[PDB]
Amino acid sequence: LLQKRVIVSNKREKVINEMRYEASFRPEGLEVVFRLDAPQYHALSVGDRGMLSYKGTAFVAFTPDP
């Protein structure tokens, strides 16, 4: 259950067998990929930097800088 300041590296929407969402966070080098559902995914903005809350590979939250 940690927190780390990162930037929203990138976001990928992918179709499988249906929709898979992934967001990458990078330290203000080294991306970390988190799986998200759509609502959580559309809430993020590639480029924003802020606080990422996480437990292992489980995304808990990302609060962009005020």
Side-chain angles (χ1 to χ4, degrees), residues 7-11 22-26 31-34 44:
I7 187 174
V8 181
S9 274
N10 76 299
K11 280 166 59 191
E22 288 170 41
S24 286
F25 296 91
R26 176 187 296 154
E31 282 186 349
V32 185
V33 186
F34 285 99
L44 294 184

Side-chain angles (χ1 to χ4, degrees), residues 7-9 11 40-49 62 64:
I7 187 174
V8 181
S9 274
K11 280 166 59 191
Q40 204 69 64
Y41 175 92
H42 294 306
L44 294 184
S45 287
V46 173
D48 275 23
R49 56 174 50 61
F62 171 81

Side-chain angles (χ1 to χ4, degrees), residues 1-29 31-61:
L1 48 174
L2 307 314
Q3 296 209 82
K4 190 184 180 74
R5 307 200 73 266
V6 308
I7 187 174
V8 181
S9 274
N10 76 299
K11 280 166 59 191
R12 188 183 64 181
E13 206 179 337
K14 174 172 62 186
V15 58
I16 62 175
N17 78 317
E18 224 84 61
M19 294 295 249
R20 188 181 197 60
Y21 307 86
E22 288 170 41
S24 286
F25 296 91
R26 176 187 296 154
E28 354 127 275
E31 282 186 349
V32 185
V33 186
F34 285 99
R35 183 205 170 198
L36 313 173
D37 57 11
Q40 204 69 64
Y41 175 92
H42 294 306
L44 294 184
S45 287
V46 173
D48 275 23
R49 56 174 50 61
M51 206 65 62
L52 170 77
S53 299
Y54 67 98
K55 181 178 292 62
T57 31
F59 172 97
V60 169

